Structure formats: C-alpha cells, structure tokens
Design an enzyme around this catalytic site. Structure first.
Site, mmCIF file in Angstrom:
data_model
loop_
_atom_site.group_PDB
_atom_site.id
_atom_site.type_symbol
_atom_site.label_atom_id
_atom_site.label_comp_id
_atom_site.label_asym_id
_atom_site.label_seq_id
_atom_site.Cartn_x
_atom_site.Cartn_y
_atom_site.Cartn_z
ATOM 1 N N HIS A 1 4.621 0.316 0.481
ATOM 2 C CA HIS A 1 5.280 -0.387 1.586
ATOM 3 C C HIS A 1 4.397 -1.522 2.111
ATOM 4 O O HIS A 1 3.172 -1.538 1.914
ATOM 5 C CB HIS A 1 5.817 0.530 2.704
ATOM 6 C CG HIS A 1 4.766 1.215 3.509
ATOM 7 N ND1 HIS A 1 4.182 2.396 3.077
ATOM 8 C CD2 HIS A 1 4.246 0.883 4.714
ATOM 9 C CE1 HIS A 1 3.307 2.733 4.014
ATOM 10 N NE2 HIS A 1 3.301 1.850 5.019
ATOM 11 N N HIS B 1 0.778 -1.227 0.000
ATOM 12 C CA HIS B 1 0.000 0.000 0.000
ATOM 13 C C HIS B 1 0.819 1.292 0.000
ATOM 14 O O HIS B 1 1.955 1.328 0.436
ATOM 15 C CB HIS B 1 -0.947 -0.007 1.224
ATOM 16 C CG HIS B 1 -0.284 0.246 2.549
ATOM 17 N ND1 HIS B 1 0.440 -0.742 3.200
ATOM 18 C CD2 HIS B 1 -0.303 1.357 3.328
ATOM 19 C CE1 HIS B 1 0.857 -0.194 4.331
ATOM 20 N NE2 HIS B 1 0.435 1.066 4.455
ATOM 21 N N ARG C 1 5.477 7.469 15.068
ATOM 22 C CA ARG C 1 5.357 7.875 13.677
ATOM 23 C C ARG C 1 4.861 9.291 13.498
ATOM 24 O O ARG C 1 3.837 9.661 14.055
ATOM 25 C CB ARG C 1 4.429 6.907 12.954
ATOM 26 C CG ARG C 1 4.396 7.105 11.465
ATOM 27 C CD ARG C 1 3.426 6.140 10.836
ATOM 28 N NE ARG C 1 2.041 6.547 11.066
ATOM 29 C CZ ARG C 1 0.978 5.804 10.762
ATOM 30 N NH1 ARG C 1 1.132 4.586 10.251
ATOM 31 N NH2 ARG C 1 -0.247 6.261 10.995
HETATM 32 FE FE LIG Z 1 1.799 2.564 6.297
#
Ligand SMILES: [Fe+2]
Ligand SMILES: [Fe+2]
Lengths: 254, 254
Positions: free
Chosen positions: A222, A86, A234
């Site tokens: 990824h 994706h 993140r």
């Molecule tokens: Fe992701």
C-alpha cells in the site's frame, strides 16, 4: 448477500449495506470471504463505530497490537495523524495479517491510499523468472534511531487461506535477496518493485468521513499519496508467518 | 617463446615469434596460448606475406571471403571509414576467431579492448548461472542490405575447453526468448554492464606490426573511438562456430 462494487479488476471493492456496530458472525464470514477475494475492502458510512465494537471486530481475525498514540484506555485502537510502496512491518519475523483503518475526519479530496495485488505481480512474471523467485529469500530491515530490526522471508509466499502464491518484496522494507550478490539483487528488486506496482495491479481509494478500509497485509503493498489535516483510527491484526518454498541455493557468500 | 600477459583475466603478448615461416610445432604452442589467454598479441610482424597470412589463418579453419587485398579475398581491409560486441552473433554460424594486423596508424589512440566471457559467467552467483543455463537469446541485425537473425544459448560451452561462457553482447543481442521483453531488457542491462567490468577486460595499444588473434567464441571486443588519425588493418576471419548449450528449460514467451 451484500452489494459489492469493485474498484479495479485487480483488487478493492466497496461493500454496501454493512453495519459493523452489531454485525453478526454470519455477516462477518461474508466480509472475511470478500477480503480473500478482493484483498482490500471499503465499508462506507460507519460514523459512530464504538470502541468496544471496533475491538471485537478486529479480535475476530486475530491478535491486536497494543501500545504510539491510542484512544484513552484502548491501546489496540491507534490514532493516525499528520510516501513509498510498502507491506506493513516486513522487517519483523511475524508481520501483521491485516489492518482496519477508519478516516474519522478530513478533506473530501486529497490523501488517497493505493493498494497493489501481489498475486498478480507474481503471476505476471514469466515462467523462468517465477521459478527463480520460488527458491529465493530476502532480508527485510529497518534501521531508525529507536529501532534496528531485520527478518528473512521467502521472495514468494503462499497465502495460508487461499493457497495462492504472492510476491513478498516491497521497496520500503526489502533490503536484499540473500542468495544473490548485492548488485544482482539490486537490479532484480528494482525491476520487481516497478513491476509489482504497475497500474494494472493497483487501485486508488478516495477517502470519505466514516469510511472503513480493511486490508490483507500478506498479499498486498500500500501507498499513501502525498497530494495534501487528517485523523484516522487503526486496529492492527498480527500473526503472519510468510511461508514459501525451501530456498534452492545457499546464502551468497562474499 | 616469451609470454607476457596483460591482465589476470585475458590477453598475453608473445615475443620471439616469426609468423612468416612458423612451424606446425610453434603454431601448436600458439594455439595452446590462444585457448589459455583468449586474445594474443604478436608484435613486429611487419611485411608478413599475404599467402603466409592465409596459410596461417587456414590452420584454425575456413576463411571468410567487400574490401580485400588484390588477388586475396581471404584478407579483408579495415581503413577506419564504439560498442561492446562479439563478431556476427546475429548469424547462425558466427566466426570462431580473427587475425588482425595493423599496417599503419598513430602511436596512441584507437586501442582495442577485449573481455573474458568465461569470467563474466563464473562471476555470476549460483542462482543466476542456473537461470542463464536454461535460456536462449535472439541476436539480430537490421540495416539496409542485411537483415539477419539467429537464436543462440545465453550460456555456451567452448568445444575445446569444455568451459561455460556468457554469450550475449550489447551490439547484436536483441532479447532473451523465454522471458517477456521487459524482464529481458532488465536482465541484459545488468549482463552487458557486468560482463565488461575492468576485472574481466584488458586494453591493447597498437603499434605498426602488431597482430591480434582472438577467440570470438568466448570474448567481446570494443573499439575505443578516441583518435582522428587514419588506421589501416588486415583481417582474416575464421568461420565454423555453432554456439551450443543446454536445451531451453522453458518455452518461448507469448
Ligand atoms: Fe501502512
Ligand atoms: Fe569486430
């Protein structure tokens, strides 16, 4: 200049001698250039990277996403916790430009992440097929209980900072090519997903505690391997507008 | 004549005809019906003379001359001793059509199906038709005693109707020349499956005395393998086709 140790001829590089904490604009410029060259970069031994430093570093690339679990009084730093190719959030008109992920703890082995090069996936196609995809657009959608969203994007997009064409379809969010009937679109996308992720265009990263991975969500897909508890931080940089050619055909009407 | 079509796609059964002593004016009507219906079926033509058969077939063009009737190599014998195909597309000049009569066989089983290559093409969306117009494919055969190959346009124009029709078939097409073998395979897979959908085909049930005349320029035919009874047939093959189309828009793949 930093010491660079690439993963594959296609993409990925491990950068050594970096200290993201009080990094200079000069050293950051070198990282922005390595990201453009290598599409995904890995900076190891960054344990103890402070929240304020993580913010200002992400802020250098663009606007951050704010909320999803986050560090106390820092909604821009997300908490990743606990298996398809994706490109992040392409069901939206403005998907993210890139992301900064730091695995803060976990197992030494298991949980590898793979990245793919969409420049090579597009280049690797033959010239008649590359011409066809330049004039095509696809709808990307997600329909879960708390979200029903979609967006049209060109099948082939140009990187705004490289001026190089990249494939812009991913198995996870791409629904269908607009200018083709659903059947033709299914067959074509089936080939493109298989092709775009062939070993020659990918790299596999094995995580170590303190490792930081910064990637370009414009020219990569990824995949997180389901071969194994893991926590990560993140930061999401937004601002993408996948632009390409003007479609050479009207939308398919049934 | 009484005309009774099989499907909207192709095929029509002609009644009130006697091929044995057909006039040039009645044949002009049959010729018109063949161009409109692609495959026509003429029942109750039992005892049709060999010289009459050869004079009839010679009205379309030169006949092919192996098992043949005594003193007539123009009349091939098919005494049955399962794949969609267009006749001899592996040759540079495939035949334009054939005239086949079933002399003796079972009442059911052994039905032959035909497909409309005009509809196969039209039924593709605009972007697909554009791609195929500028492509060509190698059609080959490789068996002990016959090793031939030929390149033909993927989309060809019928010289009498001016209408474009798909010119690929599972049995004899090897690959598209301008694409790599993987893209070629994937595309041909969709194409063979699509070109033969029920909407584009018809199924004829043979009865002793039935004659089928078909246009090998714009049809595929399939022999259903479902009966153990011996079936004899007499074929007359008309030669003279040169599948023409658009000059390739790209060079051959390397
Ligand atoms: Fe992701
Ligand atoms: Fe045949």
């Amino acid at each position: 200049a930093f010491e660079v140790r690439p993963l594959t001829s296609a993409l990925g590089a491990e950068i050594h001698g970096v200290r993201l904490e009080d990094i200079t604009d000069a050293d950051f410029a070198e990282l922005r250039r390595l990201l453009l060259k290598h599409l995904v970069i890995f900076i190891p031994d960054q344990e103890g990277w402070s929240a304020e430093s993580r913010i200002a570093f992400g802020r250098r690339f663009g606007e951050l996403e704010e909320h999803l679990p986050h560090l106390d009084g820092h909604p821009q730093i997300q908490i990743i916790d606990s298996p398809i190719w994706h490109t992040d959030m392409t069901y939206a008109p403005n998907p993210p430009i890139g992301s900064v992920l730091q695995i803060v703890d976990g197992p030494a082995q298991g949980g590898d992440t793979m990245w793919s090069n969409q420049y090579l996936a597009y280049e690797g196609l033959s010239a008649p097929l590359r011409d066809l995809l330049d004039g095509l657009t696809a709808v990307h959608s997600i329909h879960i209980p708390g979200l029903d969203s979609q967006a049209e994007h060109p099948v082939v997009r140009v990187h705004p900072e490289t001026g190089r064409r990249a494939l812009f379809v991913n198995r996870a969010h791409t629904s269908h090519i607009a200018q083709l009937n659903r059947n033709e679109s299914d067959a074509l996308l089936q080939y493109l997903y298989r092709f775009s992720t062939s070993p020659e265009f990918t790299c596999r990263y094995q995580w170590r505690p303190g490792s930081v991975a910064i990637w370009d969500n414009r020219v990569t897909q990824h995949y997180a391997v389901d071969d194994y508890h893991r926590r990560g931080l993140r930061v999401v940089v937004l601002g993408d507008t996948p632009s390409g050619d003007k479609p050479r055909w009207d939308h398919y009407r049934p």
